[model samples]
Target chain A: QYATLELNNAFKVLFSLRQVQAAEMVIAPGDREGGPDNRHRGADQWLFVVDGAGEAIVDGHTQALQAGSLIAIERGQAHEIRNTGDTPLKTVNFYHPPAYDAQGEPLPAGE
Target chain B: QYATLELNNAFKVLFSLRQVQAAEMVIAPGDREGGPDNRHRGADQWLFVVDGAGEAIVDGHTQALQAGSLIAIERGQAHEIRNTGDTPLKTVNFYHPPAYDAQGEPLPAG
Candidate 1:
């Protein structure tokens, strides 16, 4: 239930609690994740860029992301991740109230 | 309120949320932070090791840390950080319900 993992391009849910869940978000160069309509209806995501560079667009507002960029995707707010650099864009993303099941599938709201 | 910064050893608070706050926690090599009595009575901390290596004792349950280690320090859990590697240990830590004021000072427990 508790341990260490070297950051990588593999995105998966990690341990914690009902209050929050930690996970990694990685996008390959010139790749992207999420979209204008993509949304986490129940939980908020606090994300910190871990490696490479990228851009985050939440609710149509764009922000450049590099090694230490930190941003929030409030509940119900649309968001997207775009890797703008040559290397993979890795981010440490946290979900408040937990957003995914152990298998990495999206969970129902408030769950 | 959103931007990028290359990672470093400087410890300071970063952006986003009344429900959660993100901050950088850095400890020089061979040094440490917190102790047996050190704790956040008001919030739960979800920490991710960003660089280097260390050991974190949370309520006496020691855990090894390195880049990508994610651990939780529940409310009031006595915790301490020890940097055992030659390089400084850097971690991205999150505080739920907020743990510090704008100046990074401790806040009262809920």
Candidate 2:
């Protein structure tokens, strides 16, 4: 495990990995878009919109997010996020019973 | 090591165990109090006082805490917490790297 892991979700790529029982994460903004496809593999996601503003389509339900807001998405539920503001979108996300590895070890030190 | 290690820190017990590197915890109030002994069993802690009010003496320095407040106490630094309000104190605490077990694995199973 490394001290920190940072990645940008700039593409419409839906990559998935296993071996993390629970995780803490932060999301930043990009010019890219999400949605039209409704499968996030199988991830139960909980997010806290700490800063910035955005919109997400959960199961075809369009909802906007802002600072101090919290959102949850169940496994296999369709969702998409879009930034509607000029500032960067910052969010804190958590996944429970996290994705596991071949040996069932937790991966990605921190989000 | 247990589903939830819910214990009342009513007495001034200075017990130490290593098995948690980082942890997420919620603290509820009891008639109990803490301090006079300045050791947290050698763990780095970060807490957000989500609800309630209390006072703490860190290394003999007094600081009052309330909702929306954040606090941190260094290892081996003397500190004590006392709830002066009638309402119960609730705090969200996090421990990094978490306390470990004999096998050096995370002890509590969420």
Candidate 3:
């Protein structure tokens, strides 16, 4: 499907195809998600920081994130994202072979 | 397979997998590519403007592009992109089912 967005709000499955899925995530300051033990299990996630600042923790290794930064989160790796700036942390994420289903829940492993 | 990159350079096939491909395009001012009849026949493309400004002309309709702008260019639609700003127009592009081969040439039509 063809579309356009301003990347100002959080959205799940904004665009999807049989091969890939796109989503936008917006997190307020001090917010965090995922953890050391969390993993995708199915697909590789490519996260691009579009606005604000944050940190990506993968396997306990923390990497600072800011606009124009792109990180590839491999499947089965423990990861976490934390918003550390005063403004909202916005990111556009892509998953190969798709990831989340219609309701935004991760699909079954290898699905 | 796991890596981090700065979107400051123009690179093709920056990251690739069996189903998707990621590339960064940097166009200088007054530069333009594609045309009214140009299109990706094999895959849809999602483009995100990360720096500077540009315009996307699809089917003769033009859409302004600035930082934070995301545009979905569906497969088989004739489209063109022009850099309209003084600085470099930098964009991160995604291709579903992969669009280009290892050499950055468009794949065969679907």
Candidate 4:
């Protein structure tokens, strides 16, 4: 129910509960993350950039991401992430009402 | 339903919903933030430090805070935050199930 995570790695779950899920995602230089048309059909996704830089695609719009950038993608919105910096793009993400199952698969549709 | 925000202010609500709320909190040097015995009765709190340095007291225990520090405080846990560095302590906080009312008041005790 409570914890502290360093968020140093690339793509790790920090906490997962019925109401929320916390994760860290890392992307290497020139690499891309997220599905081709990723969308969380069941929950809102919160992303906070912790290290390096990148570009975030929310729906059709794109924005640059760096340390301290916070992005919120509501459930069902198409989104993507790309690492544009030379270093790894590290991010801490929070999913409300939980997004992924125990096996890391996305939950069923509908909030 | 979607937004990209720069977390630069001292305190601001980035978004609010029935399920979650996002807020940015900044503390000045050598200053203490949070209640003397603060606790969120209705939701768990997710905190990320974006700049400066500080200490986070979760259930009365102290933990150092720096850039990239992430902490999750469960419901009803006594907590406090203090800025220990010369610069301002900037943090982005997320509340699962929402933590405050529209007027910035803490929700009723459960």
Candidate 5:
């Protein structure tokens, strides 16, 4: 697990007691451009590119995913994400059954 | 995977050309009253007990999760769920990333 990445800006968490789990995201420009290593994790992850632009490789298929572009990965898919545009990417991740591993990692793939 | 758990009722897919992933659900009351088996899976799952009542065990913490009761499990947490009430549970599950496995199973816990 990597150290908790610092938030470069304050993003309000849409407080929803009605919300099971949600995280407002604004990815700060970091590291190199792209890597195809697939990330296997759980939670039926949901993400909407709220701002900026990007591209992602999911289940071996690459697509342009950016502002107003939404992506939903069902549990256990091999995937990789990258900011394919110039601006920082902003997103909101909502998780069901609200829980994460000790390393703050996403749940492992399930069949 | 269990025979594609038949959704006994017709639920509208909140067709969002913009939605990453979403499923509206109504669980049919079946079998015995309770089971505590923890189901490990991925996707930061978001569920809202839209109607009726029930309970869930997340990371060993069991709590009443019913109508208006929203529970969210972050990625990678151990979870066990059951219809703990007399009425069938109704839920709306939202997952990020929009993918699922061959079993029609949810993407395993991440």
Candidate 6:
């Protein structure tokens, strides 16, 4: 299974196997993504920073993020990724039991 | 779960959760990390190349590797990642159902 994918600098699903999925996300400077309104109900997420700097405010605490930063946001957690740098913040996000469809839409709670 | 990990130059496990795990691997030029004898029997692996150039020979086909290259190695598949460039080949590898423990040893096959 030499399955290789081309990951662009956009919010798109890169791989979606039976047990997990990966996606690439890019947030511009001064922008905030995934606040309290966004929560994955059935899957845990692992975020790996590829470029730029940001802060991930999860539940109530704020965690600094930069290149090589890896964070795991568990299921039922509320969080937001804020990019405060001058460049676009890029990250590779992974989810066990996949949090999103191939079309980039968030999957249903039990999906 | 603000689980941030430190990934060093050598092979190391960065994060291991309930259903998946992540690791960092570095292979220098002319070196190989995995080959025919190495395989995961129960979990699928996704490899993201962070730097350098290489070739991932899966089964028999040779796939090129570079920065931004994302590859998925399914369970029970035999493959090898070969580095050919002068720099070190770095990657972030992920597995569903985790192929290794926190100590970086390969998990026993199911």
Tell me candidate 2's fraction of native contacts, as a decimal between 0 and 1.
Answer: 0.00
Candidate 3 residue B92 Cα shift, in angstroms, is 0.7
TM-score of each: 0.87, 0.37, 0.74, 0.78, 0.39, 0.88
Query: Tens digits of per-residue lDDT for model 5 on B32-80?
Result: 2221113434444455554566666676667776554555555556564
DockQ of 6: 0.51
Best by TM-score: 6
lDDT of 3 by residue, A1-105 (tens): 444556666545686765667777887899886621333336777888878898988886888888777777776676778899999898888776577776777
lDDT of 2 by residue, B8-59 (tens): 2222111121221322233345343342122223443434343567766676
Candidate 4 ranges with C-alpha deviation above 4 Å: A1-8, A35-41, A101-111, B1-8, B35-41, B101-110
User: lDDT score, residue A98, model 1?
Assistant: 77
Candidate 6 residue lDDT tens string, B83-108:
98999888888877778878877777
Compared with the true structure, what per-residue lDDT tens digits does model 5 show for residues A17-51?
22234555565554122211224334444555556
> If ranked by lDDT, best first, what sequence of candidates would result?
6, 1, 3, 4, 5, 2
How do the residues B7-75 of candidate 4 rate in per-residue lDDT, one tens digit apiece? 556567677754788887888888876731244346777788878888888765788888777777766
The parts of candidate 2 lying over 4 Å away from their true place are A1-40, A99-111, B1-110
Two-way lDDT contest, 5 vs 6, winner: 6
Q: Listing candidates in order, what is each one's chain A TM-score?
A: 0.85, 0.57, 0.85, 0.81, 0.61, 0.84
**Could you tell me the lDDT of residue A83 within candidate 2?**
71
List model 1 lDDT by residue over B1-110, tens digit each.
56454457356777657578777778898888772133433667777887889998875578888777888777666777889999989887777767777677776554
Q: Candidate 1 — which pairs collide?
A: none
lDDT of model 4 at position B103: 53
Better of 4 and 6 by DockQ: 6
Deviation in Å, model 6, residue B8 alpha carbon: 4.2
| Model 3, residue A14: C-alpha shift (Å) | 1.3
Better candidate number, 2 or 5, judged by TM-score: 5
Clashing residue pairs for model 6: none
lDDT of 3 by residue, B12-80 (tens): 567775566777777789987662133444566778887888899887689898887777777667777
Residue B89 displacement (Å), model 6: 0.8
The alpha-carbon lDDT assigned to residue B45 of candidate 5 equals 48
True contacts kept of each: 0.73, 0.00, 0.47, 0.42, 0.00, 0.51
What's the chain B TM-score of candidate 2?
Answer: 0.55
